[PDB]
Design a protein around this ligand. Sequence first.
Ligand code: HEC
Ligand code: HEM
Ligand code: HEM
Ligand code: LMT
Ligand code: LMT
Lengths: 54, 244, 383, 55, 71, 124, 85, 75
Amino acid sequence: ATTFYNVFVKRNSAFVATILASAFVFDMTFETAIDNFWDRINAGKQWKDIRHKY
Amino acid sequence: MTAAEHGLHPAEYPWPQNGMLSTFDHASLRRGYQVYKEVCAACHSLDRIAWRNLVGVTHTTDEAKAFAEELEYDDEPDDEGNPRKRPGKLADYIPGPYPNEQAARAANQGALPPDLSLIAKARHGGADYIFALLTGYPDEPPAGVVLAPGMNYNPYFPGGGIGMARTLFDGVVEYEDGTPATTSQMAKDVAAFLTWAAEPEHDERKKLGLKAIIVISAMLGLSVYIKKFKWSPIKNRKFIYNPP
Amino acid sequence: MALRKKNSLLNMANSYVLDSPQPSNLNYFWNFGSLLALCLVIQLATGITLAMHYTSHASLAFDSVEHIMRDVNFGWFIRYAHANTASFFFICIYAHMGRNIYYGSYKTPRVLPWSIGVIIFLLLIITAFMGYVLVFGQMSLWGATVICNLVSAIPWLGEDIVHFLWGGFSVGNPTLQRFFALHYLMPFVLAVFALLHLIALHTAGSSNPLGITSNVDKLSMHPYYSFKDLITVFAFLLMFTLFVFFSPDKLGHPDNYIPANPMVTPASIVPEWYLLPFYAILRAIPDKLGGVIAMVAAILILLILPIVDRSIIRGNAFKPISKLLFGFFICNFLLLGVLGQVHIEPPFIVLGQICTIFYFSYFLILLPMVSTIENIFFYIGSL
Amino acid sequence: SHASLAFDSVEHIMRDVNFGWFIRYAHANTASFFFICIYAHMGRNIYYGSYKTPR
Amino acid sequence: PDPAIALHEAAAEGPCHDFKHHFDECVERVTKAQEAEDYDHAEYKEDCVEEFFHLQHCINDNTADKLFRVL
Amino acid sequence: ASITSVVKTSELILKSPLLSKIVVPLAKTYVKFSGYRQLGFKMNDLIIEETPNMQLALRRLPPTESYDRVYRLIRATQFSLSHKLATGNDITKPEEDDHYLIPYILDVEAEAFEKDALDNLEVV
Amino acid sequence: YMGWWGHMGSPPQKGIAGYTISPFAARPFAGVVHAAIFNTFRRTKNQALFVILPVSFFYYVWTQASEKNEWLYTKAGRHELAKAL
Amino acid sequence: GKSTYKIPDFTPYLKKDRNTDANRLFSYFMIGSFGMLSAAGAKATVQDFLSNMSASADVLAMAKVEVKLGAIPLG
Ligand code: HEC
Ligand code: HEM
Ligand code: HEM
Ligand SMILES: CCCCCCCCCCCCO[C@@H]1O[C@H](CO)[C@@H](O[C@H]2O[C@H](CO)[C@@H](O)[C@H](O)[C@H]2O)[C@H](O)[C@H]1O
Ligand SMILES: CCCCCCCCCCCCO[C@@H]1O[C@H](CO)[C@@H](O[C@H]2O[C@H](CO)[C@@H](O)[C@H](O)[C@H]2O)[C@H](O)[C@H]1O
């Protein structure tokens, strides 16, 4: 806990760097997660689901 | 105003795309395009839609190019400056049935069939209005209604007398996917299709809205924690007063 | 001395957004000022972006808006953001004005920020009206026709003035091009007046919900009100998101998706919802000129609140009768809004006349009477 | 601002708008005068050391 | 066969029977009134649009969901 | 409006037996519903002070009265921001709601109004 | 009428001691459940009439007007409409 | 009520572990999460919004002309 504080939080340069790197990871993973969820709730409805007939 | 003058308000039908998380049914969109092409396109244009707009929505790139290449469009003049035609490309807009308003009205006993590219947004009711209108021609006008010549009775249309006759009858279209082409089925499909034509961003818009809802909700929750945290020294302040 | 105070430029920012001393007890209704600043920023960003894709020629305007919706990447978002934020701008502005009337922000020593504010409100109306015309759909055209023919009621020169504003004998291309130029410009004027009313306010500072001095107990604007402003920003963006992404057309009128046709008149010419109360006031007076004067007076009468409020106490927090009267005033203002969109038919014609009388009589009769009587009740009641 | 109509709109200003010629030439020439004055103002500042502390 | 035909008939005979009767009574009156001479030179000619709207509005409320379920 | 006005009109009402019989009970209720006492204020703490006259009257308050007023304003502001009401001894009892400021502002205004009158005198 | 830090324009203050604790020492959501329920109830109850009375009155007015208007433009309302115009 | 050295009661609000690194770290996790979502949100906003300035679909449809070569004879 102290260790975590000292490394990622104490220096604002480190804190901002950690926030931005987290933002990058969140952005990438959230994109992927929403994509999959959207595809499941709208299953058989989207072009990707019917494309195979053509 | 009388209810007649307003038009009957259409029912709220449960469209597949109703629902914060719901896209269009693209198989219905494709079937709706086929109804447009075989029935409506006789009188109505769809001028805001290009062939490329169908691609990856209702048709593959090949199918759409095939549709475009069957038509002739005006080319740039040749080297002697004589006019020329070319086959259509994906960038071309779907061509209308009439050259101008005058020709359109002449073919329709004076009435001008509107362009259908925005009609789902340009009428109160949207898909429900289109569906109600196409399916709502009674066999006989209510006793006592006097229709003007060339008018048809339809209660959903304001005033009751519409210049467009009933056009959908069981089996006017033969769907390529084997779906029974009943009046109701065709109206549902074409209404879906026209709604897509008016708002083609609909599916993407609702997915981005879901992401925005989630992030903005989280930020709202966190913003409340941070506010309460920073304000606590002010809220918790205590005084002791000793009058001087 | 700290740089933020030493340097002249930094010091101006500092004095307004960081060290500015605020009352420690502002409630959430003091957050509409910053939401209005946010709306103004969103409208500038989306507005400038739409201007990069819009064509002001009447032969191409409507189609350019379709191009934005259909071809420009995220064009749909920019267009709907701009159109919906105009409605949110008026929700926030009515709230901000409501806050100011309820808490007596128009009283000395804040008459000047209030009076500049009344002009900001007029500029916003003009700005939003011109923007509505730029689409050049049926509501665009029929709006410009009817509203600019009100100017015809100005005696002697009125007709001449109309033709001069239109740039011709009807609403057409010249009208559209000049509304585009003015719609671009007006938001900048509006921003300057917004800044003037803040500079005027800086002499007294913010009022507060108790109506007493805050000189005894101040808080820096940052961090306390910075962080409190974030809550309403995210609440606003949630509402924005629900309209822009899920129901982008809920606040609007389908007729504007039909291209302008000078021949065909739409079923019903009703303005955008936020103009509806003023439209109801105009309909109430049968005379054309009378109606126009009434409609303008309905806005300019706000300038006399500093005179007609005779209370020795600032605001309504402690005044039960004034609170009731204010409730009725606000609800009547909403009923006027509703009557602005009904058909000119019985029994709404007479009802609109009664609501119009009530609107004016608040400023001219009731508020002066009620505020006088409450003064006497506070004195006798506390003896 | 449309490219199919821009040049023609400027001709419309020159030919059809009342005093359009004046407004167009005023705008175009004042842009040159703006730069004459700005070079002069900068020249003044450099010659008289207006860039030194505390300015 | 169009699914709507049967659903509308069922809703008219069932939950919208009172409205069906009103429309029917109206049509009887209007037809009879048109049958009588010097109807063309009358001041007020009655229609049945009001009753028709009441009926259709009712049928639609009882059918909308059912119909879209079978398409 | 001027405090002078309010005080004079009130005195006309309190003189008339009929008027006082109907107004004094109403005014007492009004004050109860107003609810400023539930924030520990005295009525006079609510009077608008950003006026030259009122600034002068406040400067003329005795130091003790002035110190107490500052505390009541700070205490009320704290209840306001916390969304709490006064409890116990913080609630202003009807007997504590004294017009500490009215005499000062009436003197300030008396002079101000005399000055305006005398600026318009005409030798006969 | 407002100064700046150091000379804000307060009457002289004397005799008030103010105390507070650090944001990091405090529970920011202390007693939130009690406040959310009991405090909101108190504050809402005290303001309810000032909202209910005007809203209920203007809603009643609108309801009566809209129902009359609807009735005047029916067949049954023909005669009353003729007089109203 | 009189002595100013008798600090008013703050026990309802005081955290027992107020001086621990765990305690500070929690609140910075909240602040940092908020900064993280704000950064991710601003990136998304900027990228989506500025993409309006990239070639629109109608423009992109006009480049990239495709031509057959089977039709073209030698010489
Ligand atoms: C041969 C003629 C013809 C065909 C076929 C036709 N229409 Fe029309 N339609 C018209 C005419 C004419 C009007 C204008 C009627 C009027 O305004 O009185 C019209 C009007 C409309 C309207 C607008 C009604 C309004 O509110 O203004 C919609 C929507 C519509 N048609 C959709 C369709 C659809 C969907 C189809 C077929 C799937 C279709 N039409 C087939 C001639 C046709
Ligand atoms: C207070 C600021 C503003 C307000 C209230 C405002 C309001 C509006 C409104 C109501 C419309 C009609 C929207 C529609 O239904 O489509 C509109 C359109 C428009 N506005 Fe603004 N506007 C503002 C600022 C700006 C600014 C600064 C620009 C910069 C050019 C601008 C450019 C446009 C354009 C090009 C349109 C037409 C395209 C369209 O309709 O979307 N706006 N504006
Ligand atoms: C673009 C529109 C406007 C913006 C951006 C704006 C912004 C602000 C801001 C930031 C403040 C200080 C914070 C607050 O009290 O909320 C404020 C205060 C004020 N505004 Fe506005 N305002 C606008 C329009 C108006 C209008 C239309 C009026 C009056 C009709 C007005 C009158 C006032 C008054 C009187 C105050 C002082 C209130 C007080 O603190 O007691 N403003 N405004
Ligand atoms: C809100 C938008 C953000 C931008 C800020 C607004 C830009 C224009 C503001 C400048 C107008 C002049 O604003 C004026 O500046 C000076 C110093 O800056 C302020 O002066 C104030 O602060 C300084 C120190 O911070 C003190 O020396 C002074 O006693 C005090 O009154 C005035 O109170 C303010 O009225
Ligand atoms: C002040 C800032 C200065 C520098 C910032 C520079 C930013 C400008 C970059 C524009 C980049 C756009 O790049 C492009 O973005 C869009 C979203 O916008 C992404 O598009 C992706 O998501 C969008 C929705 O968000 C979907 O419509 C699309 O089907 C999907 O592919 C692309 O995958 C990416 O290729």
